[PDB]
Amino acid sequence: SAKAKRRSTTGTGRMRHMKVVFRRFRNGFREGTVPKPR
Amino acid sequence: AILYKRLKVPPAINQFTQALDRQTATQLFKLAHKYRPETKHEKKQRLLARPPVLRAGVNTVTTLVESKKAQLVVIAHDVDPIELVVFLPALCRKMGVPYCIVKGKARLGRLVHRKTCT
Amino acid sequence: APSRNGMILNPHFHKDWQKRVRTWFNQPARKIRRRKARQAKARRIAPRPVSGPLRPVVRCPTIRYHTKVRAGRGFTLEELKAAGINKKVARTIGISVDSRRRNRSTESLQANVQRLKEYRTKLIIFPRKAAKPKKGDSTEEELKMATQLTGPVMPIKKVHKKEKARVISEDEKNFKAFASLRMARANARLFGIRAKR
Amino acid sequence: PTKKSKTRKLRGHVSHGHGRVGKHRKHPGGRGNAGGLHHHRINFDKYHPGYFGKVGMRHYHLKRNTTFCPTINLDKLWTLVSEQTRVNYSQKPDGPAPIIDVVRAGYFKVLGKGKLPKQPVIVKAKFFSRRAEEKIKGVGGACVLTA
Amino acid sequence: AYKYMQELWRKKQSDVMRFLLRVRCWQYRQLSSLHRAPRPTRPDKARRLGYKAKQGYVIYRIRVRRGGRKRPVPKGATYGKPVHHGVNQIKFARSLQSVAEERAGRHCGGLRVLNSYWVGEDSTYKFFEVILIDTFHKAIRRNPDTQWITKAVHKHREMRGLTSAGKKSRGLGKGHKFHLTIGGSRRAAWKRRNTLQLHRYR
Amino acid sequence: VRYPMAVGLNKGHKVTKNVSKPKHSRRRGRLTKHAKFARDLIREVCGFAPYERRAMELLKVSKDKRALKFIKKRVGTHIRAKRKREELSNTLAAMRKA
Amino acid sequence: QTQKENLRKFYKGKKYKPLDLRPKKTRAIRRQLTKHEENLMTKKMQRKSRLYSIRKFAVKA
RNA sequence: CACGACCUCAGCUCAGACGAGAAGACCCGCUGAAUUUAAGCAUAUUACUAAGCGGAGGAAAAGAAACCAACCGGGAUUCCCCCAGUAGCGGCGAGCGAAGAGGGAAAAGUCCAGCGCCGAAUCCCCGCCCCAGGGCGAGGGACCUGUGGCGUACG
RNA sequence: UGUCGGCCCCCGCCCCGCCGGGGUGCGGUUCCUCCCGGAGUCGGGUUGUUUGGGAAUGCAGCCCAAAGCGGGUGGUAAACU
RNA sequence: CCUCACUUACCCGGUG
Ligand SMILES: [Mg+2]
Ligand SMILES: [Mg+2]
Ligand SMILES: [Mg+2]
Ligand SMILES: [Mg+2]
Ligand SMILES: [Mg+2]
Ligand SMILES: [Mg+2]
Ligand SMILES: [Mg+2]
Ligand SMILES: [Mg+2]
Ligand SMILES: [Mg+2]
Ligand SMILES: [Mg+2]
Ligand SMILES: [Mg+2]
Ligand SMILES: [Mg+2]
Ligand SMILES: [Mg+2]
Ligand SMILES: [Mg+2]
Ligand SMILES: [Mg+2]
Ligand SMILES: [Mg+2]
Ligand SMILES: [Mg+2]
Ligand SMILES: [Mg+2]
Ligand SMILES: [Mg+2]
Ligand SMILES: [Mg+2]
Ligand SMILES: [Mg+2]
């Protein structure tokens, strides 16, 4: 059942934490550091 | 332990039941006490300062009797698995090295400052 | 199904072949990809040749490729020993080595020993430190005139040497070529039945 | 393309070129080579005699490089050398004869089909037929064998 | 000493080993089907398969119900053609030793199956001792000669036919005997030989 | 007067053969003094398998053909049956010598 | 973020830090060999890399 | 007849870690059909497919020969071209069907066990001293039922 | 948009040079000596399956059960070579 | 080969 798999696969919901990994990946999973202040 | 008494144990395994006498084993460890391997607590003082000894381990005593450099080999009786020392009495007999079987692999281990020496 | 004279066709399309159909639409894209990989590799090994280590000259096995030579896998340990090159230093200077190959004849052995000697003369070795030129390292003059070698390292030449026109000897004209092969075939079949005597 | 297709001129015609009585259906006689012995026997026997049955011995691991033996006839024997070479030694028929190594050109056996020009020639091949050799011997020249 | 242990284990029908196999197969069937051994019963065979006396190498004794593989069909009803009516004389494609190491690696998810060896047999049981490795112990992660098993690519290698016992069932190897698994697996070869290579210019 | 043919007993392109030491892998399975000492020692510790023990019973009553058919049924190949029967005969000969 | 700034300063240099103060890169990334363990070389390949490393060379033709 | 050593086996919300699920196009290990074709049909075919189960990674698997070959010999693996709809398999019916060589892409090789030398020369934990890289503790363990160095078919 | 044009802020690879903590020599020997190997595994029988593999390609179950100038392979079963 | 014995394999029953 491809339709049943389509309705409840990853990406059909919020992806509260997986969408953040997508944003963190494009920056190299940078942690601990902060942008240079003004 | 009772199954070892019901079944016919082959002589290559039953040979470890006939161990050394309590009087003979007492004086045997008195001589081996003067050749105990040096502990690491005292071996550091031998290095930072500025010899016959026992050779433990079944792999060491095997190449020792093969080269007939061992003057006396002491085998334990409760070695499990027994295949580690099944060949030892026959190996020491063919090579002409006197071998004895004492009771307690732990007493051999305390002789070399470890848990169990084979 | 058969209408008139024609071949008995056998199309192997009785499985689910539509699930396994590889289209070559990225064929010109993998040519650009493989080309960029050679260029990217060439910069990483900038002084060293991009084609890799020097390959030996081997003979193709079967009788169909009898007279054909080919770039082999690696130089035999015997070929390195006859050239004064250690086993574990040949990889450091870009010489392909494989220990599986053997030399069944001296023609193949002498052909690669000369190839190894010709390579070591054309080899410009840089010192491990520029401030310390050691023995095996080349001179400071040849280091400046040392560029990356494109193409195969010492491509194999197929010398099309021609037998010179000789005068046909009278003993050569009396050679029965058909009878020689016909006797060789017959003696090779009756060889075992003759050894029983 | 589809511009010159026959289906473009069958628009409007009902049966689309497949008959009203006997319509075009899904395999009215079987799929593929079906019925080759029962109802397509006449077609198989008339156009493919020998299609059914076994003949000859089996060779399990047949390697085509073992039986590789390319042949060449005597009419194309001088094609392995340049035309000027064949002419230069025609004016010198008193012993200087060219050598045509057939092995290095890609052939093993030499067959005596065509006629050979009246020139002595040394032919090097792995195999020779009886008539190819005697035509080389008759025209002058030897048949050197090679392995 | 280890040389005499392997030659001693080759005389299995001798009264010396026949007694040991008799009394150990009895003891092994009094424990649970899955039971951790305190030390290898075969130190010679364990070292030969990659076992070391470091911290992180554990041994698990597995008792598998030996014999064939009965087709799990209800009342032997395989609805189909008579070729598939076999319910009894069906043999598992994977070895019994592979079932034992796959059963020890499933119960111990935090460990990786290194190898396995034979310790006993019976008319109903085959006993194997599996060598497992704690890939997060510092005595193993700091040893460069064994850091390979700490990689994520070796997760449950016993369940993918990568261990010696499971890799034997794959039919791989160099030669004319193994033309079915050219290209890695047999499905990699089947997919390559059944893929219609439609070129750009054809 | 004679050229190298591609057929017959002396077939092949004539080249000088290169002689060299064999591959070290080809010494596999050669009995050393230590390997013979270990197997002869354990032979004294273990004894003989039930099929080796009863095949020597057929060898002492001069039934080498029945001893061969029995060992061939046990170990399999006929080439392995001769080597086993030859070894059991050497052991049986060394027994009656003592 | 003022409280965690003191917490990351208090647990600095400690062997065991709270889970929320540890780098949350990725479950797979956190389980990889550290840069210390990746740089570890056995004494055999330390010698193999000392005298049998690839040389810098060039070939004329 | 308690006190010790050891073995084997337990307990813990003990100290510190690990596993689980998701996804699953590609990948690995199993399991497994029948529509369908054979103008019926039972082997065959469909197909070592669909579905089912397990396990991964950015690739996986494979892999440095118990290989190919029979030659003037090739030389890990993977992929492409060709081999080749060929050898062969098959109610020898329907159908099925590789491999060696050759040409290319890419190329990189290696570690143990064992064998026997080296005073276990080895490792972990804990508590620390200096600058991820180095040391220390008459601290606790692991280990001789074998850690490390040398060394693996090319000797 | 075109100009690897300009400016600004993060960030990386490789090579070279000095200083610092850990590194430890390797080759050639028609010379001596010593050592050299993966068992319920191979193989055999049988069964099922798989394969183009056909007196059995691979795999597995059960039985048998190794050897060490041995063992495997050499596309037809077998013995000898 | 067959029968009768042995208990420790294996099997069954009882029991807090
Ligand atoms: Mg028609
Ligand atoms: Mg009309
Ligand atoms: Mg109509
Ligand atoms: Mg029409
Ligand atoms: Mg009609
Ligand atoms: Mg139609
Ligand atoms: Mg069904
Ligand atoms: Mg080492
Ligand atoms: Mg999961
Ligand atoms: Mg039908
Ligand atoms: Mg129909
Ligand atoms: Mg029907
Ligand atoms: Mg599926
Ligand atoms: Mg991932
Ligand atoms: Mg990639
Ligand atoms: Mg991999
Ligand atoms: Mg098929
Ligand atoms: Mg090929
Ligand atoms: Mg090898
Ligand atoms: Mg089939
Ligand atoms: Mg034959």
mmCIF file of C-alpha atoms in Angstrom, chain C residues 61-138:
data_model
loop_
_atom_site.group_PDB
_atom_site.id
_atom_site.type_symbol
_atom_site.label_atom_id
_atom_site.label_comp_id
_atom_site.label_asym_id
_atom_site.label_seq_id
_atom_site.Cartn_x
_atom_site.Cartn_y
_atom_site.Cartn_z
ATOM 1 C CA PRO C 61 47.295 -15.203 -22.197
ATOM 2 C CA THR C 62 45.313 -16.951 -24.920
ATOM 3 C CA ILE C 63 46.359 -17.832 -28.460
ATOM 4 C CA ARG C 64 43.838 -15.290 -29.762
ATOM 5 C CA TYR C 65 46.020 -12.533 -28.299
ATOM 6 C CA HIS C 66 49.359 -14.310 -28.663
ATOM 7 C CA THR C 67 51.300 -11.549 -30.437
ATOM 8 C CA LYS C 68 49.771 -8.789 -28.283
ATOM 9 C CA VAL C 69 51.458 -7.068 -25.350
ATOM 10 C CA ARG C 70 49.551 -5.188 -22.673
ATOM 11 C CA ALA C 71 50.110 -2.961 -19.660
ATOM 12 C CA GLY C 72 50.301 -5.421 -16.786
ATOM 13 C CA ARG C 73 49.296 -5.157 -13.151
ATOM 14 C CA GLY C 74 52.645 -4.807 -11.382
ATOM 15 C CA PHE C 75 56.306 -5.644 -11.689
ATOM 16 C CA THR C 76 57.369 -9.086 -10.510
ATOM 17 C CA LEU C 77 59.548 -9.273 -7.407
ATOM 18 C CA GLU C 78 62.169 -10.896 -9.641
ATOM 19 C CA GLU C 79 62.046 -7.930 -12.029
ATOM 20 C CA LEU C 80 62.585 -5.514 -9.139
ATOM 21 C CA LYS C 81 65.469 -7.617 -7.814
ATOM 22 C CA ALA C 82 67.181 -7.616 -11.218
ATOM 23 C CA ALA C 83 66.808 -3.814 -11.371
ATOM 24 C CA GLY C 84 68.194 -2.922 -7.940
ATOM 25 C CA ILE C 85 64.836 -1.715 -6.590
ATOM 26 C CA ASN C 86 63.631 -2.826 -3.168
ATOM 27 C CA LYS C 87 60.148 -4.302 -2.847
ATOM 28 C CA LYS C 88 58.788 -1.725 -0.394
ATOM 29 C CA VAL C 89 60.487 1.310 -1.984
ATOM 30 C CA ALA C 90 58.968 0.775 -5.442
ATOM 31 C CA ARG C 91 55.538 1.953 -4.289
ATOM 32 C CA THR C 92 57.125 5.111 -2.873
ATOM 33 C CA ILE C 93 58.621 6.017 -6.270
ATOM 34 C CA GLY C 94 55.519 5.109 -8.280
ATOM 35 C CA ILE C 95 56.253 1.558 -9.458
ATOM 36 C CA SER C 96 53.405 -0.947 -9.590
ATOM 37 C CA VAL C 97 54.211 -4.207 -7.788
ATOM 38 C CA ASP C 98 52.242 -7.438 -7.557
ATOM 39 C CA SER C 99 53.636 -10.615 -6.018
ATOM 40 C CA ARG C 100 51.225 -13.007 -7.745
ATOM 41 C CA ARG C 101 52.822 -12.657 -11.185
ATOM 42 C CA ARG C 102 55.772 -14.879 -12.090
ATOM 43 C CA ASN C 103 58.330 -14.860 -14.908
ATOM 44 C CA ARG C 104 58.071 -18.079 -16.916
ATOM 45 C CA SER C 105 60.662 -16.840 -19.434
ATOM 46 C CA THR C 106 63.540 -14.385 -19.597
ATOM 47 C CA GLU C 107 61.998 -12.524 -22.547
ATOM 48 C CA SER C 108 59.301 -11.100 -20.273
ATOM 49 C CA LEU C 109 61.844 -10.604 -17.479
ATOM 50 C CA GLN C 110 64.414 -8.676 -19.523
ATOM 51 C CA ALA C 111 61.645 -6.627 -21.153
ATOM 52 C CA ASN C 112 60.513 -5.178 -17.812
ATOM 53 C CA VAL C 113 63.961 -4.829 -16.234
ATOM 54 C CA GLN C 114 64.906 -2.572 -19.142
ATOM 55 C CA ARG C 115 61.584 -0.794 -18.599
ATOM 56 C CA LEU C 116 62.418 -0.311 -14.915
ATOM 57 C CA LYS C 117 65.893 1.024 -15.716
ATOM 58 C CA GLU C 118 64.484 3.351 -18.378
ATOM 59 C CA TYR C 119 62.017 4.648 -15.780
ATOM 60 C CA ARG C 120 64.567 5.286 -13.029
ATOM 61 C CA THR C 121 66.599 7.493 -15.375
ATOM 62 C CA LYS C 122 63.486 9.495 -16.311
ATOM 63 C CA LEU C 123 62.484 9.679 -12.627
ATOM 64 C CA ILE C 124 62.996 12.989 -10.812
ATOM 65 C CA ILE C 125 62.880 12.366 -7.055
ATOM 66 C CA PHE C 126 62.415 15.354 -4.748
ATOM 67 C CA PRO C 127 64.225 15.445 -1.392
ATOM 68 C CA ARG C 128 62.136 14.935 1.725
ATOM 69 C CA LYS C 129 63.398 18.352 2.864
ATOM 70 C CA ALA C 130 64.595 21.032 0.454
ATOM 71 C CA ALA C 131 67.304 22.044 2.940
ATOM 72 C CA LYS C 132 68.675 18.462 2.994
ATOM 73 C CA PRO C 133 69.290 16.807 -0.395
ATOM 74 C CA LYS C 134 70.135 13.185 0.369
ATOM 75 C CA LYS C 135 71.866 10.595 -1.829
ATOM 76 C CA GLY C 136 68.972 9.082 -3.780
ATOM 77 C CA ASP C 137 67.374 12.494 -4.271
ATOM 78 C CA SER C 138 67.853 14.288 -7.573
#
